[PDB]
């Protein structure tokens, strides 16, 4: 038996998941936590990384090789003035859109079948309120690897039917595809009851265990510890814990005092109410909250009374706490507010510092990070499908279609002149 | 036994890390401390330093040497009008992009594997609240140096695969890479309980010891000391300690006076409420906060009463303290406020004076400072990957690509004319 | 939610059926488990608003008469 200071199952910390999901208190600033826990930015950045590693491979050779088949496939190019200048652009658009829908359908299938893990939507909570995440590594029989390796072939058959030329990149990088698929379904966020995490005091090598079994864990922001043996956190949400405690105390206090003096006079010594007419309501309300006096006996020392009627003003410190929440979440991750002219809070989105602080640590512990790349920020706002049309636009893929365009127009301009 | 005046484990200073992380005091100002303890600016500045030291080395010779391989690799350049003017730019962009992704992936791997130390966050706390930092120098066996020297090769193999020419810079500067990697994991921020720092009175050579063992420490702003044996600090946070302590006293005072006059009348002589309807709630409210009189016996001297109902106005001095926090942190570190037109507090970021005050002292005591260079302020806002593209754009790397493309176009313009 | 094997299921009238999950809620020593859905973030506030609505109605319906006397 060893003495070890614990962090998880106490009121200060188990209350954190209650408040951050608003079990006991909330305000107008809680929605920015909701826009922080978007699970779709995970699949967006993930597909951006895998397609950036996909498209950049065979840009230099395969375009001139697959020019040959579509040369005979489109019988054209009689005159150099009007046919050549217009045919190359629509052929280039055709090839890029066909490989685009191919990779889009294959990636949408292999995501939507087994990337609905919704674990990031707890991972950002553990990153934001304790500065570390408990997480389990579920292991299975290697027959499930054969299940996924079978499934990816019928997945890429939808791209095979769409495009013959798109399948050549996928048959090259199927190892990377099955790698990110297996590492995708390998690790969870450990939402299981009676978990316990702690800090070992004699060697500062704090560890996570689940149900008596020691597990792996990640640390992003370790909290500071001193002679106060309950240690203090550097995490963002603990910077505003006591303020929402004050707001919740004021909320309950306001409620319990406004339900205290409902009756009009004091001396000392169910939507049914709307439906029925007022002549039964005056009978039922007068009998409903009964008049009750209040008295304690005291002989030859009589009462001298005073009286107070007030409710606490919730709106002032409500606005104060919402402004504090908004300022806090804006400073700790630099959330942008793109609006129109004279527009107020149209849309709030992840920005450049934000994805580096939260998303790339997720892919760091996922250990798929060795190939991928963080997404541009306006690229994050764009569609699930339109994103790849800009992703290879960033790549040298259509930039080499520019080079084969210049080569074909030069080879035919010398043919004319 | 010697008498030595201590600074660390007293109420004025143990209170400091509690108030700065908001265990007691809080307002809209604490978020600017959160934007000051952002640890990613450390990794951005250090990667900027190592890539600026990287890219300027072999600018003058290797570009003309590696022109030779991509001359035969791209069969082109038949006509001088359209082929030369367009091919050279995309070749230059391809080369800079490929070496960029190579150094980016290698640096991201060697960062994300062992630069999640998050020590900078506490380092800026000790710089801001006591003007000096305690820190330990952990030393291990040299087998860990061999582990890192093994790990960097498999790290730069990811750059070796994508680009052959990028490995030649890394094999030249691998000593610098292992140096900054070893000095990266060399020192910590001393987050261990029961440490003690003090000032020796007879010899003014103030020192830090950890658990009976004397250690090294850094001093940035030593506090002034006089015949008052408790000494006064010149640090920024002690300039406004008493005001947030006043705010905390007023907050607790407001809470305790608001929770005192809850009952409507006075004489002299947990969401349980919301769910349940009002008719049992009015039963539970009167029994919940019971009426209590107050009485002291006094014969032939009777009571003559008075009454006060007031709450303290928290919002006025709250706004005062937030403006205090805002202009205080603005003047001590010249933080910029870039916004849009009619824009209020979009983003706050380090400027040129701020990094010189807080970051380069960190790299000074790191002792990797002899080869690096501070980052421009607008460069700090940019992406984790986009930063290197402007980093060698500042360098003469692509500036010599301008010289070699002018040389190629001159050598072929003389070939034509 | 089946407690020993975390493989929560849907049954209809004694017959087990299929179901979909999009956002699974977090579960702990509190055997009533807490939800991460958008609407549960604002359950208590609209419940407070309804308590205030009913309370306003019942206090307005209480002091309708212009004069009140005691005895």
UniProtKB/TrEMBL annotation, chains A, B:
Domain of life: Viruses
GO BP of this protein: chromosome organization
Protein name per its UniProtKB record: Capsid portal protein
Keywords for this protein: Coiled coil, Host nucleus, Viral genome packaging, Viral release from host cell, Virion
GO CC terms of this entry: virion component
């Amino acid at each position: 038996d060893e003495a070890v200071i614990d962090i998880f199952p106490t009121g200060q910390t188990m209350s954190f998941l209650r408040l951050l999901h608003g079990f006991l208190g909330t305000c107008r600033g809680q929605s920015m936590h909701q826009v922080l826990r978007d699970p779709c930015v995970l699949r967006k950045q993930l597909l951006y990384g895998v397609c950036k590693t996909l498209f950049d491979t065979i840009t230099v050779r395969r375009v001139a090789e697959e020019w040959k088949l579509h040369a005979a496939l489109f019988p054209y190019r009689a005159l150099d003035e009007e046919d050549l200048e217009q045919y190359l652009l629509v052929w280039s658009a055709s090839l890029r859109q066909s490989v685009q829908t191919g990779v889009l359908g294959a990636l949408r299938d292999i995501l939507y079948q087994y990337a609905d893990n919704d674990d990031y939507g707890l991972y950002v909570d553990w990153c934001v309120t304790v500065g570390l995440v408990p997480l389990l590594d579920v292991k299975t029989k290697p027959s499930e690897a054969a299940e996924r390796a079978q499934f990816v072939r019928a997945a890429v058959q939808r791209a095979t039917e769409t495009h013959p030329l798109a399948q050549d990149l996928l048959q090259a990088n199927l190892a990377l595809l099955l790698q990110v698929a297996e590492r995708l379904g390998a690790v969870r966020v450990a939402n299981a009851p009676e978990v316990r995490v702690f800090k070992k005091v004699r060697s500062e090598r704090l560890e996570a265990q689940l149900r008596g079994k020691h597990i792996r864990l990640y640390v992003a922001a370790e909290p500071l510890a001193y002679e106060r043996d309950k240690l203090l956190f550097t995490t963002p949400v603990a910077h505003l814990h006591e303020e929402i405690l004050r707001y919740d105390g004021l909320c309950r206090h306001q409620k319990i005092c406004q339900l205290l003096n409902t009756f009009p006079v004091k001396v000392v010594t169910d939507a049914e109410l709307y439906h029925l007419p007022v002549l039964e309501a005056v009978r039922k309300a007068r009998d409903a909250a009964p008049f009750r006096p209040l008295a304690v006996e005291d002989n030859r020392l009589v009462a001298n009374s005073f009286f107070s009627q007030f409710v606490p003003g919730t709106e002032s410190l409500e606005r104060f706490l919402t402004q504090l929440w908004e300022n806090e979440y804006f400073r700790t991750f630099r959330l942008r507010r793109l609006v129109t002219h004279q527009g107020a809070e149209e849309a709030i989105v992840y920005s450049n510092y934000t994805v580096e602080r939260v998303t790339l640590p997720y892919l760091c512990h996922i250990l798929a990070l060795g190939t991928l790349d963080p997404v541009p920020e306006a690229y994050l706002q764009l569609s699930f499908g339109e994103i790849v049309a800009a992703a290879y636009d960033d790549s040298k893929f259509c930039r080499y279609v520019e080079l084969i365009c210049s080569r074909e127009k030069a080879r035919r301009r010398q043919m004319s002149r």
